[PDB]
Amino acid sequence: QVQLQESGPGLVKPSETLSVTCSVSGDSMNNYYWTWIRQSPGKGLEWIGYISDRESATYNPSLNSRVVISRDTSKNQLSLKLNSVTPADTAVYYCATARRGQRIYGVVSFGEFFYYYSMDVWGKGTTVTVSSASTKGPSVFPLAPSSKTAALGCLVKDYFPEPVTVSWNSGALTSGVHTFPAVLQSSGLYSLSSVVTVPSSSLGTQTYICNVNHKPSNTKVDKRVEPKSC
Amino acid sequence: TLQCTNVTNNITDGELKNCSFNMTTELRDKKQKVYSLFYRLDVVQINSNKEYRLINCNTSAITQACPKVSFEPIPIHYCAPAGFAILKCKDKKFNGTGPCPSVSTVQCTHGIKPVVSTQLLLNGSLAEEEVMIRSENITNNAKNILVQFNTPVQINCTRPNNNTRKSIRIGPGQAFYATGDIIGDIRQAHCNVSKATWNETLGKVVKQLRKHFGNNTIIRFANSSGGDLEVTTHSFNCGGEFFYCNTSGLFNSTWISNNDSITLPCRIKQIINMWQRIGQAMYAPPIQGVIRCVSNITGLILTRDGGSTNSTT
Amino acid sequence: TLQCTNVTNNITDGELKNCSFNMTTELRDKKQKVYSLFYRLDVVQINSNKEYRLINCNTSAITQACPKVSFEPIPIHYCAPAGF
Amino acid sequence: VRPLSVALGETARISCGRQALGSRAVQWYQHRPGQAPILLIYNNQDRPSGIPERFSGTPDINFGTRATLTISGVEAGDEADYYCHMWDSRSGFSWSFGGATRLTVLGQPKAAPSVTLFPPSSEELQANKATLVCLISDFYPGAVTVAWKADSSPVKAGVETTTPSKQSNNKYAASSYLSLTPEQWKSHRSYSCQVTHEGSTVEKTVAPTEC
Ligand SMILES: *[C@@H]1O[C@H](CO[C@@H]2O[C@@H](C)[C@@H](O)[C@@H](O)[C@@H]2O)[C@@H](O[C@@H]2O[C@H](CO)[C@@H](O[C@@H]3O[C@H](CO[C@H]4O[C@H](CO)[C@@H](O)[C@H](O)[C@@H]4O[C@@H]4O[C@H](CO)[C@@H](O[C@@H]5O[C@H](CO)[C@H](O)[C@H](O)[C@H]5O)[C@H](O)[C@H]4NC(C)=O)[C@@H](O)[C@H](O[C@H]4O[C@H](CO)[C@@H](O[C@@H]5O[C@H](CO)[C@@H](O[C@@H]6O[C@H](CO)[C@H](O)[C@H](O)[C@H]6O)[C@H](O)[C@H]5NC(C)=O)[C@H](O)[C@@H]4O[C@@H]4O[C@H](CO)[C@@H](O)[C@H](O)[C@H]4NC(C)=O)[C@@H]3O)[C@H](O)[C@H]2NC(C)=O)[C@H](O)[C@H]1NC(C)=O
Ligand SMILES: *[C@@H]1O[C@H](CO)[C@@H](O[C@@H]2O[C@H](CO)[C@@H](O[C@@H]3O[C@H](CO[C@H]4O[C@H](CO[C@H]5O[C@H](CO)[C@@H](O)[C@H](O)[C@@H]5O[C@H]5O[C@H](CO)[C@@H](O)[C@H](O)[C@@H]5O)[C@@H](O)[C@H](O[C@H]5O[C@H](CO)[C@@H](O)[C@H](O)[C@@H]5O)[C@@H]4O)[C@@H](O)[C@H](O[C@H]4O[C@H](CO)[C@@H](O)[C@H](O)[C@@H]4O[C@H]4O[C@H](CO)[C@@H](O)[C@H](O)[C@@H]4O[C@H]4O[C@H](CO)[C@@H](O)[C@H](O)[C@@H]4O)[C@@H]3O)[C@H](O)[C@H]2NC(C)=O)[C@H](O)[C@H]1NC(C)=O
Ligand SMILES: *[C@@H]1O[C@H](CO)[C@@H](O[C@@H]2O[C@H](CO)[C@@H](O[C@@H]3O[C@H](CO[C@H]4O[C@H](CO)[C@@H](O)[C@H](O[C@H]5O[C@H](CO)[C@@H](O)[C@H](O)[C@@H]5O)[C@@H]4O)[C@@H](O)[C@H](O[C@H]4O[C@H](CO)[C@@H](O)[C@H](O)[C@@H]4O[C@H]4O[C@H](CO)[C@@H](O)[C@H](O)[C@@H]4O)[C@@H]3O)[C@H](O)[C@H]2NC(C)=O)[C@H](O)[C@H]1NC(C)=O
Ligand SMILES: *[C@@H]1O[C@H](CO)[C@@H](O[C@@H]2O[C@H](CO)[C@@H](O[C@@H]3O[C@H](CO[C@H]4O[C@H](CO)[C@@H](O)[C@H](O)[C@@H]4O)[C@@H](O)[C@H](O[C@H]4O[C@H](CO)[C@@H](O)[C@H](O)[C@@H]4O)[C@@H]3O)[C@H](O)[C@H]2NC(C)=O)[C@H](O)[C@H]1NC(C)=O
Ligand SMILES: *[C@@H]1O[C@H](CO)[C@@H](O[C@@H]2O[C@H](CO)[C@@H](O[C@@H]3O[C@H](CO[C@H]4O[C@H](CO)[C@@H](O)[C@H](O)[C@@H]4O)[C@@H](O)[C@H](O[C@H]4O[C@H](CO)[C@@H](O)[C@H](O)[C@@H]4O)[C@@H]3O)[C@H](O)[C@H]2NC(C)=O)[C@H](O)[C@H]1NC(C)=O
Ligand SMILES: *[C@@H]1O[C@H](CO)[C@@H](O[C@@H]2O[C@H](CO)[C@@H](O[C@@H]3O[C@H](CO[C@H]4O[C@H](CO)[C@@H](O)[C@H](O)[C@@H]4O)[C@@H](O)[C@H](O[C@H]4O[C@H](CO)[C@@H](O)[C@H](O)[C@@H]4O)[C@@H]3O)[C@H](O)[C@H]2NC(C)=O)[C@H](O)[C@H]1NC(C)=O
Ligand SMILES: *[C@@H]1O[C@H](CO)[C@@H](O[C@@H]2O[C@H](CO)[C@@H](O[C@@H]3O[C@H](CO[C@H]4O[C@H](CO)[C@@H](O)[C@H](O)[C@@H]4O)[C@@H](O)[C@H](O[C@H]4O[C@H](CO)[C@@H](O)[C@H](O)[C@@H]4O)[C@@H]3O)[C@H](O)[C@H]2NC(C)=O)[C@H](O)[C@H]1NC(C)=O
Ligand SMILES: *[C@@H]1O[C@H](CO)[C@@H](O[C@@H]2O[C@H](CO)[C@@H](O)[C@H](O)[C@H]2NC(C)=O)[C@H](O)[C@H]1NC(C)=O
Numbered sequence: 001q002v003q004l005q006e007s008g009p010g011l012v013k014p015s016e017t018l019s020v021t022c023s024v025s026g027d028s029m030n031n032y033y034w035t036w037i038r039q040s041p042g043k044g045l046e047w048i049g050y051i052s053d054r055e056s057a058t059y060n061p062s063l064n065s066r067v068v069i070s071r072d073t074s075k076n077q078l079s080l081k082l083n084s085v086t087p088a089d090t091a092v093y094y095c096a097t098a099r100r101g102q103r104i105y106g107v108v109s110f111g112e113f114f115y116y117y118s119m120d121v122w123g124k125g126t127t128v129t130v131s132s133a134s135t136k137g138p139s140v141f142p143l144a145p146s147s148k149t150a151a152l153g154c155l156v157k158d159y160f161p162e163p164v165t166v167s168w169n170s171g172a173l174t175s176g177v178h179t180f181p182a183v184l185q186s187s188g189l190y191s192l193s194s195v196v197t198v199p200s201s202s203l204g205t206q207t208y209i210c211n212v213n214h215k216p217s218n219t220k221v222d223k224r225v226e227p228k229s230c
Numbered sequence: 231t232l233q234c235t236n237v238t239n240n241i242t243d244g245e246l247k248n249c250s251f252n253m254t255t256e257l258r259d260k261k262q263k264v265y266s267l268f269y270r271l272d273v274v275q276i277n278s279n280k281e282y283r284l285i286n287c288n289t290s291a292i293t294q295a296c297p298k299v300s301f302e303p304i305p306i307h308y309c310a311p312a313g314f315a316i317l318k319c320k321d322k323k324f325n326g327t328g329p330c331p332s333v334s335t336v337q338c339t340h341g342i343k344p345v346v347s348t349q350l351l352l353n354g355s356l357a358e359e360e361v362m363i364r365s366e367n368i369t370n371n372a373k374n375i376l377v378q379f380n381t382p383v384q385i386n387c388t389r390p391n392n393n394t395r396k397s398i399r400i401g402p403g404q405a406f407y408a409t410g411d412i413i414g415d416i417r418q419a420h421c422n423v424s425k426a427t428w429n430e431t432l433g434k435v436v437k438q439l440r441k442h443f444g445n446n447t448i449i450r451f452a453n454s455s456g457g458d459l460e461v462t463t464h465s466f467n468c469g470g471e472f473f474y475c476n477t478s479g480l481f482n483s484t485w486i487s488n489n490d491s492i493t494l495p496c497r498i499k500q501i502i503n504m505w506q507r508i509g510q511a512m513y514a515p516p517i518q519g520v521i522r523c524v525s526n527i528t529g530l531i532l533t534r535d536g537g538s539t540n541s542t543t
Numbered sequence: 544t545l546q547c548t549n550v551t552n553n554i555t556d557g558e559l560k561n562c563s564f565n566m567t568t569e570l571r572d573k574k575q576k577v578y579s580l581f582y583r584l585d586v587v588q589i590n591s592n593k594e595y596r597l598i599n600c601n602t603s604a605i606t607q608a609c610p611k612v613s614f615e616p617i618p619i620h621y622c623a624p625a626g627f
Numbered sequence: 628v629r630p631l632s633v634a635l636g637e638t639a640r641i642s643c644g645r646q647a648l649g650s651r652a653v654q655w656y657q658h659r660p661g662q663a664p665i666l667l668i669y670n671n672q673d674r675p676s677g678i679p680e681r682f683s684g685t686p687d688i689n690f691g692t693r694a695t696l697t698i699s700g701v702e703a704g705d706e707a708d709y710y711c712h713m714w715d716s717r718s719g720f721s722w723s724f725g726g727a728t729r730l731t732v733l734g735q736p737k738a739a740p741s742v743t744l745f746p747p748s749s750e751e752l753q754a755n756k757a758t759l760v761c762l763i764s765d766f767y768p769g770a771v772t773v774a775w776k777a778d779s780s781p782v783k784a785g786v787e788t789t790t791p792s793k794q795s796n797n798k799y800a801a802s803s804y805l806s807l808t809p810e811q812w813k814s815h816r817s818y819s820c821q822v823t824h825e826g827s828t829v830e831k832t833v834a835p836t837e838c
């Protein structure tokens with residue numbers, strides 16, 4: 001049950017060290033090889049580097065040696081730092097594992113083979129944005145439902161940057177959850193919305209707490225939703 | 231002058247050069263920017279990227295073997311005219327020197343394939359009963375020692391490279407066969423020998439040697455001490471290409487009074503001066519596709535050592 | 544390469560080409576701007592006026608028959624040795 | 628990116644971006660947007676566990692054959708980005724996965740868009756702001772033009788509409804927003820969100836005077 005989980009900073013100013021960690025679960029760190037991967041908005045996929053059991057890291061040369069990678073056998077925490085960041089570096093970052101395939105065609109004593117890596121297990125893909133604009137936390141308001149299966153939710157207004165995660169009752173309300181795309185205002189400020197479905201007889205008896213988290217601004221909001229006073 | 235670049239491989243280093251160069255055409259004024267591939271033994275650099283030239287060009291003129299003629303050996307029976315005849319010494323254990331007990335006459339020898347090979351003998355005649363060991367003189371270590379097997383040793387030699395051949399027009403009538411790309415994986419030529427039967431034959435021999443040196447003694451095998459490529463390694467023509475294989479792994483052994491296979495790294499050359507005759511060299515054209523050939527190893531040519539330690543080994 | 548022009552006739556058409564070309568001399572460096580005439584069956588054009596080349600040049604080497612030897616046929620009597 | 632589109636139930640086949648040079652070890656992967664990537668093929672033909680056998684690759688028979696995936700029985704859930712990671716005995720270390728072939732599976736049934744409208748909350752109206760949100764869900768295809776109406780008249784002022792994006796049900800979803808103030812919010816009798824889908828319209832209307 002080997003699991004992967006990232007931890008992004010959420011925002012860094014250009015030309016600053018960009019720290020990301022991918023927490024390792026379900027096994028030890030010394031059985032396989034490790035790797036990180038990104039995707040910039042509108043662009044394709046991008047391989048960064050890898051590091052083996054004997055910990056010698058190996059990078060993609062297209063990075064001008066601005067990348068460093070470290071593990072932690074005790075912590076089981078795979079680290080990652082990026083100095084001298086640029087706005088073009090805003091992207092969405094994953095973590096995965098590397099199996100060293102060995103494709104053998106001719107004779108092995110002559111080394112007529114090669115090593116290839118396939119990516120099996122994957123991370124969730126946190127989001128980071130290189131920007132020099134000051135951070136912006138989200139604004140929370142509880143949308144009141146209708147009095148005539150109905151609908152209710154919470155509003156996330158003018159936060160910078162992404163991401164912002166919404167959970168209902170601290171992860172206790174799952175079925176019905178529909179979150180919608182965050183608009184880009186002309187002010188460069190995001191605005192999203194999350195919604196979950198419930199029966200018509202649970203209003204007032206059930207307490208619904210949307211749990212908002214904007215980690216860049218360290219904004220964690222446990223907001224409650226109530227019906228209108230009419 | 232040849233503009234040679236090393237060959238396209240993912241590091242892990244060339245032996246083979248992708249050499250561009252200007253050539254002539256059938257038109258006496260128009261010239262020809264072309265490129266070919268060559269093994270490093272055919273070129274030598276000449277002092278930007280490095281320019282080269284054929285190793286012969288400075289000593290010996292060079293001609294391209296006709297692609298129609300084959301170098302394959304054919305059994306030849308030598309024959310005697312009227313008034314002369316041939317005598318075939320038939321006794322089984324016969325050291326080639328001295329009189330012969332059983333003598334018969336033929337007018338023609340048997341089928342004899344003129345195999346041109348160094349170190350190892352291939353496709354040849356086998357001995358009867360014990361393996362016979364003949365040398366004009368053994369006290370003279372300088373006198374080469376010739377061995378005849380009773381049993382053949384199989385060997386499987388390949389050029390594991392699917393070979394393109396470009397034909398280049400220098401005419402009228404004159405056409406040069408270059409090498410295009412290798413098709414696919416780049417592997418190096420080699421030969422295999424059953425490590426078992428090999429080591430089996432080493433012992434059958436070494437027991438035939440103590441017949442000439444001690445009841446109890448030590449016997450060691452070493453690779454060649456030095457010389458040209460033809461002597462230091464095993465020369466032979468396999469499939470048209472000319473192979474040269476490192477036999478250090480065959481002669482790396484020691485012998486006291488009482489399943490898998492080896493593999494031999496081989497080298498291919500195209501410009502050839504065989505019989506060493508300066509002034510004149512032959513350029514063997516390339517052979518298309520992957521090359522493979524298999525031969526009965528049937529004899530050997532060996533040299534001893536010197537006084538050194540007296541009787542130790 | 545041969546700079547060939549059609550032959551000088553009053554229209555009513557060449558078969559024969561007035562071909563200028565550079566040649567070599569007995570001196571290995573000095574070269575020789577010359578011209579000759581050829582029947583069209585000996586030349587082939589090669590793609591300003593059209594340049595040409597001998598039809599053989601691309602397949603077969605070419606040698607000029609000695610002007611002294613004659614191709615004239617001579618009666619030959621084939622003969623048999625003793626025993627035949 | 629290289630466009631491609633196959634109908635439902637058909638057999639699909641994807642050619643690799645680059646071409647083989649020497650023996651090869653081909654890796655194919657699939658990327659759902661926002662999701663994590665998924666490996667499908669390693670070692671030309673070897674399929675990991677849990678991968679549908681609808682997807683067959685190209686074994687190494689010594690060249691000739693180009694690296695290619697085969698998806699029998701195309702489904703609607705087969706819409707994603709596709710990368711062919713090539714590895715061979717010659718070209719060298721492969722830091723890139725080649726081009727992205729973004730597959731779009733069409734022929735799906737049309738779904739009536741689920742449209743719903745919300746008024747400004749009491750907590751937000753106490754902050755001297757007003758905003759109207761319109762969420763569309765469960766509709767195919769994702770070709771929608773979201774419109775607002777002040778009483779019976781259209782409004783282009785401060786119109787923020789998100790691009791319709793697929794949900795996990797292979798149906799698009801979009802959010803629309805309207806920048807306002809509490810005074811213009813309480814000034815009109817009723818505001819409507821208009822969601823026209825395929826000429827048909829699913830419109831929702833709210834009024835400040837009704838519970
Ligand atoms: C050594 O040896 C070697 C080898 O060789 C080989 O082998 C041999 C043996 C033989 O066989 C031969 O043949 C071969 O080749 C050599 O090397 C090299 O090699 C190579 C290989 O391949 C080659 O190459 C090739 O070629 C061809 C040709 O091409 C050309 O031509 C054509 C026509 O025909 C065209 O089209 C093109 O384009 C080209 O070129 C051109 O040209 C023109 C004219 O000249 C130009 O123009 C110009 O311009 C300028 C400006 O800019 C100015 O103006 C001037 O004046 C003008 O003139 C242009 O430019 C050009 N272009 C360009 C672009 O450049 C061909 O055929 C081929 O190709 C093909 O295929 C491919 C595929 O496969 C494609 O694509 C490709 O891809 C790749 C990948 O995959 C890429 O790569 C990339 O790149 C980038 C950058 O860009 C980066 O780097 C990256 O990383 C990488 O990866 C590439 O690039 C590409 N390419 C191109 C070209 O682009 C192509 O394309 C084609 O195909 C097609 O395409 C299209 C687009 O275009 C598409 O759409 C379609 O689809 C497709 N299709 C298919 C089917 O695929 C090739 O390329 C060569 O050639 C060789 N070389 C030689 C010289 O030969 C060497 O050399 C040797 N060495 C010694 C020393 O010797
Ligand atoms: C002189 O002597 C020389 C020295 O002996 C000699 O050199 C030899 O040259 C030959 C070529 O002529 C070379 O032969 C090649 O060898 C390769 C190795 O083959 C062995 O291993 C493979 C795979 O084994 C891996 O997987 C299993 C399962 O996990 C593991 O148990 C293995 O350990 C190994 O796994 C590794 O990775 C794992 C991670 O997943 C690790 O857990 C693990 O620890 C390992 O690291 C077996 O399949 C082979 O079995 C075959 O042979 C046995 C007996 O040996 C048979 O019983 C059996 O039926 C099989 O035939 C073997 O054990 C091969 O890769 C290679 O064959 C491929 O390459 C050639 C060249 O491109 C292709 O033509 C061919 O089609 C093969 O490609 C297929 O297979 C590979 C491997 O699976 C795939 O990568 C490829 O995509 C393709 O597979 C697809 O199609 C196949 C059908 O086409 C199908 O099988 C696949 O499933 C798939 O669909 C080739 O045989 C040899 O290496 C040289 N060296 C030696 C020492 O022999 C020289 O020739 C001699 N010359 C003369 C003249 O005498
Ligand atoms: C020690 O002895 C052993 C055994 O004596 C030798 O082993 C030999 O190794 C050589 C290479 O070193 C091998 O030679 C090559 O073998 C090819 C295989 O030919 C067979 O298959 C084809 C197709 O199935 C058949 O047509 C052939 O039949 C021919 O021969 C039989 C007799 O066996 C005749 O009855 C037939 O009439 C045919 O003549 C064989 O069964 C063969 O392709 C190849 O010959 C081509 O190549 C040479 C140049 O390399 C050309 O001159 C020649 O014209 C041929 O070219 C044709 O084919 C090639 C493809 O190969 C195409 O590219 C051309 O377009 C063209 O069509 C060559 O003979 C040999 O097989 C093998 N065995 C024997 C018994 O000789 C060891 O070498 C030897 N060791 C040493 C150091 O001498
Ligand atoms: C087959 O043979 C030909 C002819 O010998 C070779 O190609 C020539 O190589 C020479 C040597 O580099 C080239 O000379 C270079 O020429 C440049 C000026 O060229 C201009 O004029 C020519 C016509 O004369 C035009 O074709 C051309 O477009 C230019 O407008 C100079 O820039 C060069 O000198 C400068 O640059 C070099 C670096 O490139 C520096 O090292 C020098 O110090 C200097 O700064 C240079 O002299 C020549 O142009 C080539 N082409 C010809 C003559 O047509 C082939 O390489 C050869 N191929 C083989 C052997 O495989
Ligand atoms: C390589 O070929 C040569 C001949 O071409 C052989 O060499 C012979 O080897 C033996 C042993 O080394 C030598 O024999 C000994 O020579 C002594 C004197 O030699 C003179 O007389 C002989 C005539 O017999 C002349 O040919 C020679 O030129 C000399 O003038 C004799 O005194 C010896 O006899 C006694 O001694 C030995 C042991 O010392 C005993 O075994 C004998 O029974 C006897 O008691 C003896 O004959 C011989 O001289 C060498 N011949 C030549 C011509 O040089 C090699 O044997 C051969 N190598 C192999 C491996 O076969
Ligand atoms: C004919 O056949 C013989 C025998 O096969 C060949 O001799 C070999 O020659 C090579 C070339 O020098 C020798 O290779 C050397 O091997 C070392 C092995 O490296 C790793 O391997 C072992 C275990 O696998 C580890 O213990 C070791 O630490 C390594 O991890 C390398 O150390 C050598 O290269 C390094 O050292 C040299 C300095 O000595 C540096 O200059 C290099 O840059 C490099 O850092 C080296 O490659 C091999 O050992 C020889 N074997 C024998 C038995 O002699 C002949 O070459 C061959 N001849 C022909 C003409 O084909
Ligand atoms: C035997 O061989 C010679 C040498 O190959 C050929 O004669 C040459 O032909 C070329 C091709 O036309 C001539 O090149 C032309 O040269 C002009 C510049 O020449 C100046 O400099 C030279 C010395 O280098 C002086 O002799 C000369 O007086 C000039 O001062 C350019 O004007 C030409 O290019 C321009 O004009 C032509 C049209 O004429 C256009 O098509 C071009 O695009 C361009 O606008 C041209 O390059 C060369 O001068 C000739 N003489 C030499 C090198 O001495 C013979 O034709 C050949 N005879 C055969 C095969 O029968
Ligand atoms: C090869 O064996 C023959 C016999 O088969 C040896 O011949 C003897 O040679 C000597 C001269 O040195 C003669 O005097 C003997 O009469 C020969 N013996 C016989 C039986 O004919 C010969 O010495 C051997 N040579 C080698 C190099 O082994």
Ligand SMILES: *[C@@H]1O[C@H](CO)[C@@H](O[C@@H]2O[C@H](CO)[C@@H](O)[C@H](O)[C@H]2NC(C)=O)[C@H](O)[C@H]1NC(C)=O
Binds near residue numbers: 422
């Ligand atoms: C060299 O190759 C020959 C034939 O190419 C091999 O002989 C065959 O070996 C296979 C197993 O690899 C057997 O199944 C066949 O029956 C054998 N055939 C014959 C005619 O002998 C031989 O073993 C190879 N030798 C080495 C050292 O690799």
